[model samples]
Target chain A: MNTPEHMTAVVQRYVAALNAGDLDGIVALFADDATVEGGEPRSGTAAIREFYANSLKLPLAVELTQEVRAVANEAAFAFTVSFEYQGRKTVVAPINHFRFNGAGKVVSMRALFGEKNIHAGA
Target chain B: MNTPEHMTAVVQRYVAALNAGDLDGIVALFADDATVEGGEPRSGTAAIREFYANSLKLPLAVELTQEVRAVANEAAFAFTVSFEYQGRKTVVAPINHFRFNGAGKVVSMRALFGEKNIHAGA
Candidate 1:
């Protein structure tokens, strides 16, 4: 059973990987057929790896801003990702949902965010 | 400003309305053109009202199982809805995401739950 504690642990691990800029480490947490949906959906390990690799191109800092909600083989977490580009800083707040398979690997992940959620640094 | 506090309050009110079986109150929280997606999408006030009314056919006991995640005019909540039908009890755990308009009314709502997330109550 994917208990709340187990799911929460996965979310923490994900955030840690993001902060550490460990692209491989982050992709390892997903199942072979996992799908990630930000605006578009990326299915399978190869696409997921490519997506993370692109995201990690910039020096990104990620932090979990709210508690994780885990229940029934799924978990949702709120967090912020900040990065600086060309002397301009940007912060994006997103809520990501993950569904775990029987083996405790994330089978699906969806990130919810929009233009309004992106803030330009002062 | 559509602060996080404002979004959290709306989520609380939504849960309260569900628990109270107040269909009108629940519908009122949504904008006239709000869109809600579960397995499908229900758009506009009329469709939204019909959806909630049908859900209310069964006496539902709704409770928030985790802290609300509110940020950037959006809120995601994890909760369980329990009801009994024909002497059998069923509990569904769903993570609901709501996007608020400038008026603090929900413009979009999405409930995420799958067959695996539903439990057969004893």
Candidate 2:
């Protein structure tokens, strides 16, 4: 079982990795058999790695907006992902869920956001 | 599929009902076959109603601390549930997930909070 402190640290590392544009660091936090769902679910480390690679194409400014809530084997955090492309700035505030395996690696990730949470040119 | 607006409304009503100590109002936001987990999983409306009814023993002051993140028929919110009992006041910050069915009723409710998220006294 993953302790709450461990889970919380993992989430912190994830945000740090994302902001630092560390693809390998981001992939290392997930289990080999993990699935990530930003849109369609991407299964396995390879697919998830690809997903993050595509996301990291643009430098992202990601930060936790609130303290993480973690219990049992699941954790959820509220954060904002900001990036600029072609002089247009966008920000997406999403509540992301991470389910960890016994070994403490995230085995499932679901990013929940809607159009309302996405701000363009703001 | 439930719209984001509908899902958000359900969450607002849920918090309002909890603050009002209105068990019936709380039950009205859930599907007949919904499952709620504050502790162990409680399935079906009967069990869910029982669970909330028991929670209503202490008057609660519940409010959302952040914006509701809703997408793909699911909504997650960061909120604090506060209650006072016998000269002791406690506040619990939890990230709650609500999965809405096509009919716009919540089919699943999960409240995630760890020991660190609980604040004793002020």
Candidate 3:
């Protein structure tokens, strides 16, 4: 089981890397065989690396909106990612669940959010 | 897949029932074969019913700290439950994940939290 502080710090590190668009930093946080699921599932570091690379194509404003909940080698965090899409500013809030390996690297990540979680700003 | 609004309503109703200590109301939100894992998994409505009955022994003050996130028949929410234990007030903040059945009943619930998520009040 991962320590609560370790899991919490990992979540913060993820948000930081996301906002900084550090693809390598983000990929380093995951296990080699880790799988990520936002809408679709992407398995392995190679796929995960490409996923972030594409997501970071445009600068994003990523921030954790609430305290992270971590326990039993798992952590879930609520955060928002703001970006521009088709001349409109859009913000998507998601609840991400991460299951970590004993080595403290994330083994699985699932991001949950729907259209209702999206906010548009002029 | 469940609609975002339906999943959101279930989460809200869950929090309200927890605040009211309504065991039946909480049970009603789950499928017959649902499983709940606050720490250990309690499967089936009978088991889930017993679990909640024990938890509702003392009155609880529960509320959502952040908006519920729902997508693809799954939802995750951040909330806090306040109670008195050993003559001292305590608050626990957990991120609860729920997977809904086609019938819109929650088929699985996993609540993630650790010692760090516990707040002790004198």
Candidate 4:
């Protein structure tokens, strides 16, 4: 069982990696069999790598807006990912949940975001 | 699988019930065999009822600060619960995750908050 502190630290590292636009840094936090769920599940390190790589193509600016919620080997975090595309900027706020394995690496990640949560720049 | 909109409505209803301080209203959203995990698992409707009743003793004021995160059959929400006691006030920010059953009732609720997430008011 991962302590709350350890899980929170892992979430912090994830946010930092996203802000730095470090694809390798972000993927390093997940286990080889990690599965990410948004609209669908992207399982395994290869799929997870490709997902992050595509997300970082727009120079995404990500930040954690609330304190990390860590308990019972799982954590949930709320954050905003903003990027400019096609002369318009969009901000998407998503809450991501991560379940850790015995070794503290993330085994699963599910991102929760809907159309209403996405805002277009005025 | 519950739609994101449906799950988001459930979360909104939960926050509304908390704000109204309606114990029965809150419990109605949960299934009879629902389980809640924070420090421990409060299983069944009886335990869940007692849990909310005890929490309501302080006249809690709860509000959702961030947009609800709902995907598939689950949702994660971040909010603050504030109350006053002994002429002092405390604000606790917690991230809560809920999983819905086929009937749209919550089957599980997990609240995540640590000591660091609680703030003291002057």
Candidate 5:
């Protein structure tokens, strides 16, 4: 199904912020109570800001190969990303589980990947 | 959404056969052209039987906590399974991507899990 334009815009903003090394700009997309689960928990804008602060230090860029968003009011995206970290780069394909709040903002984020390949991104 | 009885029955049968150490019985559930990804590819009943022949030797048992099945005729199951193997047991919650044929028989099975934890079950 075609993803909603607003949701796609949000995903693109996040991707652009990451590529531009705009840690604060990326954090702006997350709601205050947004929780990121995978590498670490990035809660609140302060923590989220700090999370991306460290993330930007690494070579990170995302090229969305495919995405499927929920058709309902609530939306989610599944994406494949090629990540570079610790001088090693690998394609870490993750099905990003998300819940969008009423304001069309992300409230919860669960970055899911294969257990054997979780460390591949790092 | 409530899962269809037929799909639920398939999962239960597979789980029961595995718990009961019924290697051949479990293999029977898969279609002749079924392909299993992750760990290894078990093609046909012969290869499926061989794969489980080794699997049955492990201390394996599955207790499903939650499941979400597609409402469409082509059904899929996402499950949380607590498995025990090699004297070390852990819960490997995997989203099993399955495609069923016209007869509701599973023709392709891709067990998706976190990369870091892929080897934990073994």
Candidate 6:
């Protein structure tokens, strides 16, 4: 019912790591048994690492414009992810889902984007 | 910007008021010049109240499943909203955008859903 103070910090740290391309840093924020649902769902830090690493090729960073905290343990962000791919700039609007455990560790992460595949016109 | 503690609380309270049909309660959380972008965009608390009152026609309560905190000031959530309308169940996957002011009042809110104006079978 309440959004704890520390939990908010954890989320901020998680995104900073993502935009910074610190795969290790990002993974460190997840619970040991954490799960990620990028375009594809993944379980564990190893898989999560792989998912983010793939983004490296595109040099994309997610930019947040708004936030909705449904509760202390949960929040939602509306963002635009932009990157350079094949010498062209690609920007997309994405909605990400996150769940925090009792220890304030992100236990699960999920991403949702428009249906138009990123590579559709490429 | 970091997601300040009070901003998150504003969001939680706003949603609770919406679900409880406390139109006046929800309006109190908004800034005098708040903006909303739903199927259409509206500015100020009066319009927002009208929007929610219309939603009253259907008893819908949004259920949050996951949240993504992009920053201390921004987070995203994934949720499924279901309600019975006209004697039928209507379910929608909606992504809402929220932005708060320095005093923890919601300044902007936006909502997006699947494309529905066109259909192949129509």
User: lDDT for every model?
Assistant: 0.84, 0.91, 0.91, 0.87, 0.60, 0.64
lDDT of 3 by residue, A12-106 (tens): 99999999999989999999999998867899999999999988988999999888888878998899999997899989998898999999999
What is the TM-score of each predicted model, taking all chains together?
Answer: 0.61, 0.96, 0.95, 0.89, 0.46, 0.49
* Model 4 complex DockQ against the native: 0.65
User: Which portions of model 2 miss their true places by more than 4 Å?
Assistant: none
- Single out the weakest 10-residue window by summed lDDT for candidate 6 chain A: A112-121
List, residue by residue over B21-121, the lDDT tens digit for candidate 3: 88899999999999999957799989999999988898999999878888888988989999997899988888899999999999999988888889997
Docking class of 6: incorrect
* Model 4 per-residue lDDT tens digits across residues A13-37: 9989988998889899999999987
What is every candidate's C-alpha DockQ against the true complex, given to 2 decimals?
0.12, 0.84, 0.81, 0.65, 0.04, 0.05
Judged by DockQ cut-offs, the docking class of candidate 2 is high
Model 5 C-alpha lDDT per residue in residues B1-122, reported as the tens digit of each score: 22345555776777778778887677777788888764357688677777778766765666543343433333333444556655776765455545566676767776644432233533
Is candidate 3 or 6 superior in DockQ? 3
lDDT of 3: 0.91
- Candidate 2 achieves a global lDDT of 0.91
Tens-place lDDT per residue, model 1, B32-121, is 999988646799999999999988998899998756767667788778899998899898877799989999899999886656568895
lDDT of 4 at A88: 95
Alpha-carbon runs more than 4 Å astray in model 4: B1-5
Clashing pairs in 2: none
Better of 2 and 5 by lDDT: 2
Q: Which residue ranges in model 6 land beyond 4 Å of their true spot?
A: A68-70, A116-122, B1-122
TM-score of 3: 0.95
lDDT of 3 at A30: 99
